[PDB]
Amino acid sequence: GMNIDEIERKIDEAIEKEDYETLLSLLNKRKELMEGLPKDKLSEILEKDRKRLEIIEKRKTALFQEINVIREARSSLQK
Amino acid sequence: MNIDEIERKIDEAIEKEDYETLLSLLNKRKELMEGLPKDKLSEILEKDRKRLEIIEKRKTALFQEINVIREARSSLQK
């Protein structure tokens, strides 16, 4: 099966691609490995996950922004 | 810009998913609507119904992308 280093690499690749469905699948496979890691490896992954969360939150807020521009455009197109 | 150029650019902005330009264009178009012939106005209104269907589908896709992100966020917060 896929090792922790490969999974982590692919997780970052998926985030860069903005492929959130594949990100989910990867996190679900990673879930199995988290308890067996050495303490320092787990710590580093958890810190990186914090940075990964920021990246996807940035995108989330940007998607809401785009939806609000669409709502404004609708005001002229509707009726 | 004349009406036919504004209309063309509206459809180009929708295809490019450039909603700020779309909004900009629609604001520019408002000035011209009152002076149009009846048939031209009828054509534009029917086109707007179809344009709105396109952006509404886009809005649905954005909310679905937001939902995927929420799942990923939950998974990263475990």
| Three state DSSP letters for chain A | CCCHHHHHHHHHHHHHHCCHHHHHHHHHHHHCCHHHCCHHHHHHHHHHHHHHHHHHHHHHHHHHHHHHHHHHHHHHHCC
Q: At what angle do helices A39-77 and B19-33 cross, to 10 degrees?
A: 10
Q: Measured between beta carbons, which residues in chain A are less than 8 angstroms from residue B19?
A: 66, 69-70, 73
**In the block, which residue shows the tokens 């005001």?**
A75
What residue in A sits closest to B22 (Cα-Cα)? A73
Architecture of domain A1-79 in this structure: Helix non-globular (6.10)
Architecture of domain B2-78 in this structure: Helix non-globular (6.10)
For chain A, the domains span 1-79
Q: Give me the resolution in angstroms, 1 decimal.
A: 2.0
CA distances from B41 to A64, A73, B35 (A): 32, 18, 9
Provide the 10 A C-beta neighbour count for residue A27.
20
Name, in order, each residue with C-beta under 8 angstroms of B7's C-beta and a sequence gap of 6 or more. Answer: B29, B44, B47
Q: Is B74 on the interface with A (CB under 8 A)?
A: no
Quick check: A4 and A33 in contact, CB under 8 A? Answer: yes
Q: Using CA atoms, how far apart are residues B33 and B53, in angstroms rounded to an integer?
A: 21
Experiment type? X-ray
Quick check: B71 and A24 in contact, CB under 8 A? Answer: yes
